[PDB]
Symmetry: C3
Subunit: 253 residues, 3 copies
C-alpha cells in the first residue's frame, strides 16, 4: 500500500515528459529508497536512469519493494492536464492492478483523481555501464539543449571535442558544416566548467542527444561525462532529491 506525494506536481510533469521522449512504457521500482525508473529505447542504444530519493516527497511509504510498469504515453496525457502548482499523490494497493494519481489545490478546494491501468513489463536487463572518470564538462542546460537542436540542421551526428579549457560541437550534412565553441570560465566564487584528464573526442547520435536535452527543464546545469570508447553520460540533477541520467553509445571508426 505505497504512497508518494510530491508538493508541486510540476516536477512529475517535467519528468515524464523527458522520459516519454525515450521510451513509451517503463517500470517504477518503488523501494523505501525512493522511486526509480531504468529503461532502454527500442533500438537498445540509450539508457535512462532516474532516481527520486524518498526525501524528495512530502509523504512517502514503501515498506514493500514493489514494481509498477505503466504507459508513459498515457501518463503524459493525464499529466498534461494537471495543474503545475497542485500537489500530486501516486498510490497503489496490494495486487490492485491500478495505480492512482491525486491532485489537490493549495487552497484545498479542487480535488482531482485519475486512475491508470498498469503493466506487465519484462525485466530491465542491460544497465549501468560505468564509470566514465576521464573527462567532465558542465554547462547551462538550456544552453546545451539549444546547441543540439541547432546541430540538427546539419547532420544527426554531433562531434564533441574536449580541449584544454574547450568543448567544441561540430556537425555535417548536405547544408554544410557548423560548430560551436565554448571556452571554460573558472572557477569561483559567489559558464562552462570543463575538467578533463584527456583531450578526448567522441561523437554521438543527435536524435538521442535531443531526446536527453529536454532535461533542461529540471536543472539549470547539465553534466557530461565521457570515456574513450565507452557509453557517455548526461546528468541532470535535482538539487536535493535526485537525478536523471542518460547514457548513450558513441559512433565507432
Amino acid at each position: 500500500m505505497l504512497e508518494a506525494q510530491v508538493q508541486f506536481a510540476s516536477l512529475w510533469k517535467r519528468l515524464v515528459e523527458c522520459i516519454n521522449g525515450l521510451v513509451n512504457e517503463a517500470n517504477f521500482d518503488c523501494n523505501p529508497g525512493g522511486l526509480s525508473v531504468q529503461a532502454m529505447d527500442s533500438s537498445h542504444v540509450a539508457l535512462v536512469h532516474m532516481l527520486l530519493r524518498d526525501d524528495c516527497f512530502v509523504k512517502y511509504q514503501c515498506g514493500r519493494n514493489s514494481i509498477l510498469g505503466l504507459n508513459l504515453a498515457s501518463l503524459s496525457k493525464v499529466l498534461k492536464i494537471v495543474d503545475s502548482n497542485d500537489s500530486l499523490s501516486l498510490r497503489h494497493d496490494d495486487d490492485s492492478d491500478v495505480v492512482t494519481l491525486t491532485s489537490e489545490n493549495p487552497e484545498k478546494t479542487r480535488k482531482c483523481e485519475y486512475q491508470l491501468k498498469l503493466l506487465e513489463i519484462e525485466a530491465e536487463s542491460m544497465g549501468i555501464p560505468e564509470m566514465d572518470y576521464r573527462s567532465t564538462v558542465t554547462l547551462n542546460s538550456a544552453e546545451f539543449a539549444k546547441i543540439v537542436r541547432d546541430m540538427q540542421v546539419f547532420g544527426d551526428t554531433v562531434t564533441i571535442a574536449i580541449s584544454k579549457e574547450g568543448v567544441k560541437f561540430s556537425s555535417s550534412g548536405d547544408v554544410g558544416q557548423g560548430y560551436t565553441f565554448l571556452q571554460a570560465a573558472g572557477v569561483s566564487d559567489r559558464g562552462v566548467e570543463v575538467t578533463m584528464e584527456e583531450p578526448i573526442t567522441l561523437s554521438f547520435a543527435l536524435r538521442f542527444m535531443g531526446i536527453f536535452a529536454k532535461g533542461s527543464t529540471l536543472s539549470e546545469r547539465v553534466t557530461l561525462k565521457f570515456a574513450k570508447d565507452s557509453p557517455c553520460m548526461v546528468e541532470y540533477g535535482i538539487d536535493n532529491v535526485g537525478y536523471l541520467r542518460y547514457y548513450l553509445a558513441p559512433k565507432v571508426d
Copy 2:
C-alpha cells in the same frame, strides 16, 4: 432597414466563435428588442439561444422584424480580420440581398467594409425547454472550460454529480478514469455556489459541453442548471446586455 453598431468589435468576434461551434448558418431575428439567434445542431441534441439586447449596441435601429440568414463560417472568417478595438456596424437595406459590416478606427483614420451574401435558412424548428430546475451550480467560466477539456482525455461522456458542498465531473475510457471535484461552503457577505433541492446526477456528450465552454470569453462566470431526466442548461451572461444560453440533452438510456 437595420443598423446595429457595437462599440468594440471584440464582442462580435467572440460570440460568433461561441456559436459557430454548434451550427454553421443561423437565422438572426432582428427586431426592436435587439438581435436574437436560436439554433439547433444537426442531431437535434443541443440548442443555442443568444440575445443581444438593443442597448448592447452604441446605436440600434430596427423598425420591423426582419430575419437574416448568415453563414457563420464566412462571418467568422471576416470577423477574424476585424480588430478587437474597432467599432462594428451591421447594416442591411430594404431588399439588399446582402448584409454589410463596417468597421472604423477609434481615430477615424481607417475604414473597413465587408459584405456578406445572405442565405435563406430552413426555420430553426424545436423550441426552448424549461423550466423547473432542481439544482443550480455557478462556477468560474474558465475553470469549467478546463474541466471539460480535461475530461475529454478520458472518454467523451462526462457525468456531473451534484451533492451539497460538491459537484463531481467524472469520465472513463481507454486512457483511464478521471474526476475533478469542486466544493461550495461559506462565506456571506464576501468560488462555486450550489443549490439545495435534491441530489441530482446526469451525463452529457463532451463534444458539446466543449462547444459550450467557449462561452468563457464572454463572461467570468457560467451557470449550470439541471433537472431530473431533462435538458441541462449552461448560460453565460453577456454584461447584463444579453445572454448566451445553451441546452443539451442528457445521455440517458
Copy 3:
C-alpha cells in the same frame, strides 16, 4: 578576399526570411559600394532588389567585385539557429567556393562557425523596370502587412486605388467582398501620406503582396509607387544603410 560583419544578426535573419519567400537561391554581388541581391521569382512576375551600403557593417572589405551564389533554403536554416543579438561575420577566401558565417557573443564567450557550399546561378534576365510616375503612398509597414493577409480571406487579387483623399484596398471571392480605406488629408502638424499626380487604379497578385509584406519586419514604414499599366514597387528602407525593394507586375485582362 571578402569580409562583412554586421553588429546585430537580427538584420540578416529578418532579411533572408524576406527574400527566401521569393526565390530559394540567389546571387550576392559584393562590390566595394556594398552587398546587393537582384532576384526574380520562377514565374518571372516579380522582383527583389536588395542593397546594403558598406557603411552598414561594422567591418567591410571588398577590393574587387566578387559574386556569391547561394542556397536561400540552407541559409534560412542556418540563420534560424543564430541568436538575434550576436555579431555575424561573412567571409570568402580567393576562389574558396565555401562562404563562412561567424557568430559571436557580445562578450566573446561562445563562438559559432557555419560553412555553406555555394553555387552557380545563371543571371536572371531583364534588369529592373525604370520609369516611375506620380502615384505614391506611404503607410505603416505593419498596417500594410495586415491589409494583405486580411484581403486574402476574400480572393487572390487585391485592387489598389489611389485618390487624393486616401488609398482603397478591395477584394472579392467566395466569402464575399471586402475593402480597407485609409486617408491622408493632413497632418497639421505633428499615418498615411498619399502624394499623387492623377488617380490610378491597378490590381495585383495577393500571393506576392503577402511575400512582399514580410518586409515590415525591416522598416516601420513602407512606400508603394505606381504607374498606369506598370509594375508597382514596394520599398522598405533600412535605416539609411540600405533598402529592400520589390517590383510586381499588375494583372490586366
